[PDB]
Design a protein around this ligand. Structure first.
Ligand SMILES: *[C@@H]1O[C@H](CO)[C@@H](O[C@@H]2O[C@H](CO)[C@@H](O)[C@H](O)[C@H]2NC(C)=O)[C@H](O)[C@H]1NC(C)=O
Ligand SMILES: *[C@@H]1O[C@H](CO)[C@@H](O[C@@H]2O[C@H](CO)[C@@H](O)[C@H](O)[C@H]2NC(C)=O)[C@H](O)[C@H]1NC(C)=O
Ligand SMILES: *[C@@H]1O[C@H](CO)[C@@H](O)[C@H](O)[C@H]1NC(C)=O
Lengths: 75, 936, 218, 24
C-alpha cells in the first residue's frame, strides 16, 4: 500500500510544480529552493517510471522533508 | 469454491482408510512405501516418512468387495477378492494395474506362490474343489486340476518350494487326513498319502510346515506334538513335551508359526509355538528332535523378519504386570540361537485407559556398522496406528486415528463466551449509586479505553483448551464426533485439530447411537452438558453417558439405571431451574422416565402431561402406534395404524427439524392477494417400498400423516419406481428422489402444501381443531446422475434462500436452488405467470461444474451432510462425512452482511482528497472571477 | 434486532457516500457559478426597457403629483411615443449514481425507524436479491438518493441563497400592451385631505431629543 | 387492501410436542 500512496503523492506534487511553472515561467528555476524541489520531483518521477518499466534512487524520497523548510516562514 | 483465491482459507479435508487387515513392508527399501489393505474394501500405499497417502483405490462397499488374500512379490502386489472370484496384480511403483482376471466358481481356501530352478514364475490358487496354476507375468492360466475326493475331504493348505512339486493337504475332522503331491511342469497327480487322526479337527489354524516340508501339529488331548516328513514318510511321529517341560493351556487352541523368507528354498528349522494366551516358545527341529531354544512367558506379540541372510524375531511385552501403565517394550532376537541383540529395546505407551495392541508388523534394514536396525507398525484396540522408530525422544514417528472412518453422530456446540467479556458483564453496565455515579464511572471507562487505544498504537513501531473463546460472528464451533468403534472426538471446527478424545468400553459393532445437547454455554455458573444414549443390538440393554462438550470429562451427576430396554426418546423444550432441557425415555413396558427427575421438573410434567404425545413405528410388522402421556408418567394408547408387510415395507420416516424458524406465513402471487401456507408442526412423511421386485410391478408409496391424532393427510403411490429413496421434508414442502425403470433414469418429485385464502386461526395451531384438509401440488423432474446424500441448508431467521446440497457418487457436492423445484411453474406461459415472475416448466435439471462447493476436494463414499446456522444471516457451515471428512461454509445469497474482502481503501482516500482539492480550487476561481467582473 | 451487521461496513460505506454527495454538490454549485453566462445588450434594448419601466412607474404612482402634470405626461407617451451549461447540471447526478451503484452496491446499509408497507420495498432494495426481507432495510443506492434529496435546506443554509441542485419578445407588442393598459387609468390625487389628517393630533416630538449632539468621528 | 400487513404477522406457537420414529 505504501507503494501505491507514492503515486498520489507524486501526482499532487507534480500538478503543484506544473502550476508553479505555468505561473512563473523562467523565474521558478533561478530560486534555489524551487530548483531543489523541482529536481527532487524529477528524480522521483524518473525512478518511478524506470521501476514501472521493468531501488537505489528511493533514498531521494528521504530528501522530501527538507522541502518543508522551503515555504514555512521564520525558518 | 469460487474465484480461485479463497482456496484453503475456510475449507479443509481429511482422508482416511479403514482398519488394517493385511500389510506388507519389505521393499527395496530405497523407495519408502507401505502397502496396506483395510476392512473398508480399500487398498492404499502410505508414505513411511510422514504417514501420508501416495495412492488409494476404493472398491464396492458391500460384501462383493472384501479382500480375501494379499501377497507381495518384488515391486508387485497380488490380490484375490470378491469371494474368490477376482484376481488382480497391482503395480506398486505407479499405483496403476498390471492385469485383472476372473477365476472359476468355488470357495477360496488359500493362496500360494511357487517357482522353479530358483525363479518364481507361477501363482497357485486353491478352491474347495480344484487347484489352479496361473502365470505370474501375464496372469494367463497354466493349468487346473481336480482334487480327489473333494466331496468330504476339506482341503486347507498349499505348500511347495524349489524342488519342483506342489503339495495339497486336506482334512476330515477326527478322521483321515490326505496329502496329494502334484508336479509343477505338467500337473499330474504323482503321489497320494493318507493317515488317521482321531484327535484334531482343524488344519489351517493349528498346523504348520517347517524345514524340508515337514508337517507339525499340536495335540493337547495326547499332550504332545505330531510330525510327518512329507518327502519320505507315511506315518505320524509323536513327541512328548515333558523333555522340554512345557504345558498346554486348558480350553485353548495352540498354534504353530513357521517362517519362509524365500519361496524358492526350504523353510527355517526354527519356529514359534503359541502355547497359552501370553505364552510362546521358540523351538528348533532337527531329525525328530526338539530343542528348547527359548521360552517367553507373559508376552504380548511376536513377529518375524529377514534381511539378506539374517532372520530376526521381534517380541513385544509389558514391564510391570492388565499391564500397569500401558507401557510396552519391544526386543529383537536372533532366530538361529535364542539371544537378545543389545541396544534394540523400544519402549512406548498408550494414552487411552483401556486399550491394548493387537497387530505387530516389523521392517528391518542393515545399518552402516553392520547392525540390524528396525521400525515397527502397531495397531491398537481402538483402530489407532502408530509407526515406531529406534530413537530416544522421538519413539513415535507418526500416528493415524482410523476410527474416524465410521462416524455415526455429529453435533456443533458454540464456544463459551469470552471470559474477558463474560466476567466483564458483571463489572460493566452495573448499577452502583445515584445519578452522580454512573456517569463518573462511564467517563473513567472512557479514559481507560483511551489509554488502551494509545497503548495499542504504541507498539506500531515498538491452541489451548482453556483459552478458547467464541468469535464475534460465532463462525467457529466445537465439533463432537461419535464413531462406530465407540470413540468420541472433540475437534476444532476451524482447522480440524483434535482437541480431546474419549473411549467407551464394550461397544458392539452394530449398536445404535443418539446424542442430544442438553445444556449450552449460555449460563456461566453451570457447565455445558451433553448426553449420549447407547443401545445394544443383541441383548437390548440401554445406557446413558453424560459429559461436557468442551473438556470431555464425565460429569459428576450420575445418570439413572435403565432396568428395561428403551424403545424411544424425546427432548422437551421445558427447562429445569438449572436451564437443562428435560429428556423423556419410553421403554418396552410403555412407561416413561424423566431426566433430570427433580421436584420442579416432576411438578411441571404433572401440570403439562396431557400435551405430550409419543409415536412408535414397527417396520417388521408395519405397525404405527401413538400414545399420550398421563399425569403420573404413565402412557395410554391413543391411535393405531397398520400397513400390511406382504405388500409394502417402510424404509424411512422424516420429521421437521425442531430448531428451524419459518419467516413468512404466506405467499404473494400478485394482484393484491395472499396464498397461505399450511405449517403443521407435527407432520410426518413415511416412505414405503413394494415387495414385488419385478421391473413392471414395483412402486413407492408416500404417506403424509399427523403425529397427534393419526389422520392420513395424504396418500400417494408412484409406479414403475425402485429404491433407494432420498427424502427431505422441510417447513412447507417434501422433495424425494427415486429411480424409474421404464425409462431407466433418476427422478425428483416435489410436493408442496397450501391452505386456502383465509387463515383458519392466526393465534395458535392445535392439531385437534383442524377439520379441513390442505391443498397439495406435485411435480416431477429428471436428474441426470445418481445421489449418495441429500440435505438442506439452514439459517438463523430463514431469510436467505433455501438450497439443496446433493452428494454425488463421484465425490463432488452440488448446490441446487429450491426455487427451481416449484410445482407452480406453468407449462403454458401466461400474463399472470409473467407478473408472478415464474420460469416456464422444463423437464430437465442440468449439472454445472461451477455449482460445486468443493472444487477438487472430493469425498469418497459419502454418507452424511450436516449444516449449521453459525450466528449470521448469510453464512451456513457445511460438514460432509463419508470415508473422508470435509468442512466449509456456503452463502446462498452472496453474503449481503459482511463487507467484501477486496475493498480498495487507497482509491477511496484518493477520490476524497481529489474532491476536496477540486472544491477548494473551484471556490478560488469563482471568487476571483466575481471580483474581476465587479471591477470590469 | 433481526440482523447482525459488521461495524466495518458502518465505518467504511456509510460516511463516504455522504462526503461524496456533499462535495459533489458544492463542486456543482461552484462550477455553475464559474461559467454561468455572458450576455450583451445593445443601446436600443436598454433604452426601450427603461422607457417601459418609466411608463409602468407613471401608471402605478401618478397619484402623488398634481393632476395637471399627470395629464401632461399622459398627453405624452400616447401620441408621440407609443405609436410613433446544463449538461453538468443534471448529467453528473446520473453518472455518479451509476458509479456508486457499480462500486458500492451489494449489502444492507441501514434501516428507517418507522414501519412501512410492501410498496416501499421495490424502491429501497435495488441491489439486494432477498425476497422476504422487510422494507425498512435499505440498499446503498437508495441511501445515496435519499442523501441527495435531503440536502437542499442544508445547501441553502451553509451556502449563499439557493443553488447546487436541480429544480422582451417584440418591442411593438409591448408598446401596444402598455398603450392599452395606460389608456384606462385616471388620476386620483392622494393629497386632497392631508391637512385634516395632520390636524387630528399633536406631532410626535417624543424620543427625538435624547442622546447628545455628536462632537467628532467615532 | 390485502397482501399488506403480512410482514407484521408474527408466527403462532405449537400446542403439543411429539417425537419418535423407527424403533431404536
Ligand atoms: C384459535 O385457537 C386458540 C387456541 O385454542 C383459541 O384460544 C382459546 O380460545 C378458547 C375459546 O375460544 C379459550 O377458552 C382459550 O382460553 C383460548 N386459549 C388461548 C391460549 O388463547 C382461539 O379462540 C382460536 N381463535 C378462533 C378465532 O377460533
Ligand atoms: C485442486 O485445484 C487447485 C486449484 O487452485 C490446485 O491448486 C493449484 O495447484 C497448482 C499445481 O501445483 C499450483 O501451481 C497452484 O498454485 C495451486 N493453486 C493454489 C491456489 O495454490 C490443486 O493442486 C488441485 N488439487 C490437486 C490434488 O491437484
Ligand atoms: C506412568 O505412570 C505415572 C503415574 O504412576 C504417570 O505419571 C506417567 O505418565 C505414566 N507413563 C506414561 C508414559 O504415561
Amino acid at each position: 500500500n505504501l507503494e501505491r500512496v507514492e503515486y498520489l503523492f507524486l501526482i499532487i506534487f507534480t500538478v503543484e510544480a506544473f502550476l508553479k511553472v505555468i505561473a512563473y515561467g523562467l523565474l521558478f528555476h533561478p530560486n534555489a529552493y524551487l530548483r531543489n524541489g523541482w529536481n527532487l520531483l524529477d528524480f522521483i518521477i524518473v525512478v518511478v517510471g524506470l521501476f514501472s518499466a521493468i531501488k537505489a534512487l528511493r533514498a531521494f524520497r528521504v530528501l522530501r522533508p527538507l522541502r518543508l523548510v522551503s515555504g514555512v516562514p521564520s525558518l | 469454491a469460487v474465484y480461485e483465491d479463497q482456496v484453503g482459507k475456510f475449507d479443509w479435508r481429511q482422508q482416511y482408510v479403514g482398519k488394517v487387515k493385511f500389510a506388507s513392508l519389505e521393499f527395496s527399501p530405497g523407495s519408502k512405501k507401505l502397502v496396506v489393505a483395510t476392512e473398508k474394501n480399500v487398498i492404499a500405499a502410505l508414505n513411511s516418512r510422514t504417514g501420508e497417502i501416495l495412492w488409494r483405490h476404493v472398491d464396492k462397499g458391500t460384501a462383493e468387495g472384501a479382500v480375501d488374500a494379499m501377497l507381495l512379490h518384488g515391486q508387485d502386489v497380488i490380490t484375490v477378492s470378491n469371494g474368490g472370484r477376482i484376481m488382480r496384480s497391482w503395480e506398486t511403483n505407479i499405483g496403476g494395474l498390471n492385469w485383472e482376471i476372473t477365476l472359476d466358481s468355488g470357495s477360496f481356501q488359500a493362496l500360494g506362490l511357487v517357482g522353479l530352478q530358483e525363479s518364481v514364475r507361477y501363482i497357485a490358487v486353491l478352491k474347495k474343489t480344484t487347484l489352479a496354476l496361473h502365470h505370474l507375468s501375464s496372469g494367463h492360466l497354466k493349468w487346473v486340476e481336480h482334487l480327489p475326493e473333494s466331496d468330504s475331504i476339506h482341503y486347507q493348505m498349499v505348500y511347495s518350494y524349489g524342488s519342483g512339486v506342489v503339495w495339497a493337504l486336506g482334512v476330515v475332522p477326527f478322521s483321515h487326513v490326505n496329502i496329494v503331491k502334484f508336479n509343477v511342469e505338467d500337473g499330474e497327480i504323482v503321489q497320494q498319502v493318507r493317515v488317521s487322526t482321531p484327535w484334531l479337527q482343524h488344519l489351517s489354524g493349528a498346523c504348520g510346515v517347517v524345514d524340508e516340508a515337514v508337517l507339525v501339529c499340536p495335540d493337547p488331548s495326547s499332550r504332545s506334538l505330531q510330525t510327518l516328513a512329507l518327502e519320505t514318510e507315511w506315518e505320524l511321529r509323536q513327541i512328548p513335551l515333558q523333555s522340554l517341560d512345557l504345558e498346554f493351556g486348558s480350553g485353548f487352541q495352540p498354534r504353530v508359526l513357521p517362517t519362509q523368507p524365500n519361496p524358492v528354498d526350504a523353510s527355517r528349522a526354527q519356529f514359534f509355538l503359541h502355547l497359552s494366551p501370553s505364552h510362546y516358545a521358540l523351538l528348533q527341529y532337527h531329525y525328530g528332535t526338539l530343542s528348547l531354544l527359548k521360552n517367553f512367558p507373559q508376552t504380548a506379540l511376536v513377529s518375524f523378519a529377514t534381511t539378506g541372510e539374517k532372520t530376526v524375531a521381534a517380541v513385544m511385552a509389558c514391564r510391570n504386570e492388565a499391564c500397569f501403565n500401558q507401557t510396552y517394550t519391544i526386543n529383537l532376537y536372533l532366530v538361529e540361537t535364542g539371544r537378545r541383540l543389545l541396544d534394540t529395546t523400544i519402549t512406548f505407551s498408550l494414552e487411552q485407559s483401556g486399550t491394548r495392541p493387537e497387530r505387530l508388523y516389523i521392517q528391518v534394514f542393515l545399518k552402516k556398522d553392520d547392525s540390524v536396525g528396525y521400525r515397527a507398525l502397531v495397531q491398537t484396540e481402538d483402530h489407532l496406528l502408530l509407526f515406531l522408530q529406534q530413537l530416544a525422544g522421538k519413539v513415535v514417528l507418526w500416528s493415524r486415528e482410523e476410527s474416524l472412518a465410521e462416524v455415526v453422530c455429529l453435533e456443533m456446540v458454540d464456544l463459551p463466551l469470552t471470559g474477558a467479556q463474560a466476567e466483564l458483564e458483571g463489572e460493566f453496565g452495573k448499577k452502583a449509586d445515584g445519578l452522580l455515579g454512573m456517569f463518573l464511572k462511564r467517563l473513567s471507562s472512557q479514559l481507560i479505553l483511551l489509554q488502551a487505544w494509545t497503548s495499542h498504537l504504541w507498539k506500531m513501531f515498538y491452541i489451548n483448551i482453556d483459552t478458547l473463546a467464541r468469535d464475534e460472528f460465532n463462525l467457529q464451533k466445537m465439533m463432537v464426533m461419535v464413531t462406530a468403534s465407540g470413540k468420541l472426538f472433540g475437534i476444532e471446527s476451524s482447522s480440524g485439530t483434535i482437541l480431546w478424545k474419549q473411549y467407551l468400553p464394550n461397544v458392539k459393532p452394530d449398536s445404535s447411537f443418539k446424542l442430544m445437547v442438553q445444556r449450552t454455554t449460555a449460563h456461566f455458573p453451570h457447565p455445558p452438558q451433553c448426553t449420549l444414549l447407547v443401545k445394544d443390538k443383541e441383548s437390548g440393554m440401554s445406557s446413558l453417558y453424560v459429559f461436557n462438550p468442551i473438556f470431555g470429562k464425565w460429569s459428576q451427576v450420575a445418570p439413572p439405571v435403565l432396568k428395561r430396554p428403551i424403545l424411544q426418546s424425546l427432548l422437551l423444550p421445558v427447562m429445569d431451574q438449572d436451564y437443562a432441557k428435560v429428556l423423556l425415555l419410553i421403554d418396552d413396558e410403555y412407561k416413561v422416565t424423566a431426566f433430570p427427575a427433580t421436584r420442579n421438573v416432576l411438578r411441571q410434567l404433572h401440570e403439562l402431561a396431557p400435551s405430550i404425545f409419543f409415536y412408535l413405528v414397527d417396520a417388521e410388522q408395519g405397525r404405527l402406534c401413538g400414545y399420550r402421556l398421563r399425569k403420573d408418567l404413565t402412557t395410554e394408547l391413543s391411535w393405531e395404524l397398520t400397513i400390511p408387510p406382504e405388500v409394502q415395507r417402510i424404509v424411512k420416516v422424516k420429521g421437521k427439524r425442531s430448531s428451524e424458524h419459518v419467516h413468512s406465513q404466506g405467499r404473494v402471487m400478485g394482484d393484491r392477494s395472499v396464498l397461505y401456507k399450511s405449517l403443521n408442526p407435527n407432520l410426518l412423511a413415511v416412505v414405503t417400498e413394494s415387495t414385488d421386485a419385478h421391473h413392471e410391478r414395483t412402486f413407492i408409496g408416500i404417506f403424509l400423516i399427523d403425529g397427534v391424532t393419526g389422520r392420513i393427510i395424504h396418500s400417494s403411490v408412484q409406479k414403475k419406481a425402485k429404491g433407494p429413496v432420498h427424502i427431505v421434508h422441510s417447513e412447507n414442502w417434501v422433495v424425494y428422489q427415486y429411480w424409474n425403470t421404464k425409462a431407466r433414469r433418476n427422478e425428483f418429485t416435489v410436493l408442496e402444501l397450501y391452505e386456502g385464502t383465509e387463515q383458519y386461526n392466526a393465534t395458535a395451531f392445535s392439531s385437534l381443531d383442524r377439520p379441513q384438509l390442505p391443498q397439495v401440488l406435485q411435480q416431477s423432474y429428471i436428474f441426470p446422475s445418481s445421489i449418495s446424500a441429500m440435505e438442506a441448508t439452514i439459517t438463523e431467521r430463514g431469510i436467505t434462500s433455501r438450497h439443496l446440497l446433493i452428494g454425488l457418487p463421484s465425490g463432488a457436492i452440488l448446490s441446487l436452488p429450491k426455487a427451481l423445484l416449484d410445482p407452480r411453474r406453468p407449462e403454458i406461459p401466461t400474463e399472470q405467470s409473467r407478473e408472478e415472475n415464474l420460469i416456464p416448466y422444463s423437464p430437465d435439471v442440468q449439472i454445472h461444474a461451477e455449482r460445486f462447493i468443493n472444487y477438487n476436494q472430493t469425498v469418497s463414499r459419502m454418507r452424511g451432510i450436516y449444516t449449521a446456522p453459525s450466528g449470521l444471516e448469510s453464512t451456513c457451515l457445511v460438514v460432509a462425512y463419508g470415508l473422508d471428512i470435509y468442512q466449509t461454509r456456503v452463502y446462498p445469497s452472496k453474503q449481503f452482511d459482511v463487507l467484501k474482502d477486496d475493498y480498495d481503501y487507497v482509491l477511496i482516500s484518493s477520490v476524497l482528497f481529489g474532491l476536496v482539492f477540486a472544491t477548494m480550487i473551484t471556490k478560488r476561481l469563482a471568487q476571483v472571477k466575481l471580483l474581476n467582473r465587479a471591477w470590469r | 434486532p433481526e440482523l447482525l451487521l459488521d461495524s466495518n461496513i458502518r465505518l467504511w460505506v456509510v460516511l463516504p457516500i455522504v462526503i461524496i454527495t456533499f462535495f459533489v454538490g458544492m463542486i456543482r454549485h461552484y462550477v455553475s457559478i464559474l461559467l454561468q453566462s455572458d450576455k450583451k445588450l445593445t443601446q436600443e434594448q436598454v433604452s426601450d426597457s427603461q422607457v417601459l419601466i418609466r411608463s409602468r412607474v407613471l401608471r402605478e404612482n401618478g397619484k402623488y403629483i398634481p393632476k395637471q402634470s399627470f395629464l401632461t405626461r399622459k398627453y405624452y407617451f400616447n401620441n408621440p411615443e407609443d405609436g410613433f451549461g446544463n449538461v453538468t447540471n443534471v448529467l453528473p447526478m446520473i453518472l455518479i449514481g451509476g458509479w456508486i451503484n457499480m462500486t458500492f452496491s451489494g449489502f444492507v446499509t441501514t434501516k428507517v425507524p418507522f414501519p412501512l408497507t410492501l410498496r416501499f420495498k421495490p424502491m429501497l432494495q435495488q441491489g439486494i436479491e432477498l425476497l422476504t426481507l422487510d422494507a425498512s432495510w435499505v440498499s446503498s443506492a437508495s441511501w445515496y438518493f435519499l442523501n441527495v434529496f435531503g440536502l437542499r435546506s442544508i445547501y441553502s443554509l451553509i451556502l449563499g441563497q439557493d443553488n447546487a441542485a436541480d429544480q422582451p419578445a417584440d418591442t411593438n407588442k409591448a408598446f401596444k400592451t402598455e398603450w392599452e393598459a395606460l389608456e384606462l387609468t385616471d388620476h386620483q390625487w392622494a393629497l386632497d385631505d392631508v391637512e385634516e389628517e395632520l390636524m387630528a393630533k399633536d406631532l410626535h416630538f417624543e424620543g427625538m431629543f435624547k442622546k447628545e449632539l455628536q462632537t467628532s468621528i467615532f | 387492501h390485502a397482501s399488506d400487513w403480512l410482514a407484521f404477522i408474527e408466527p403462532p406457537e405449537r400446542m403439543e410436542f411429539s417425537g419418535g420414529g423407527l424403533l431404536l
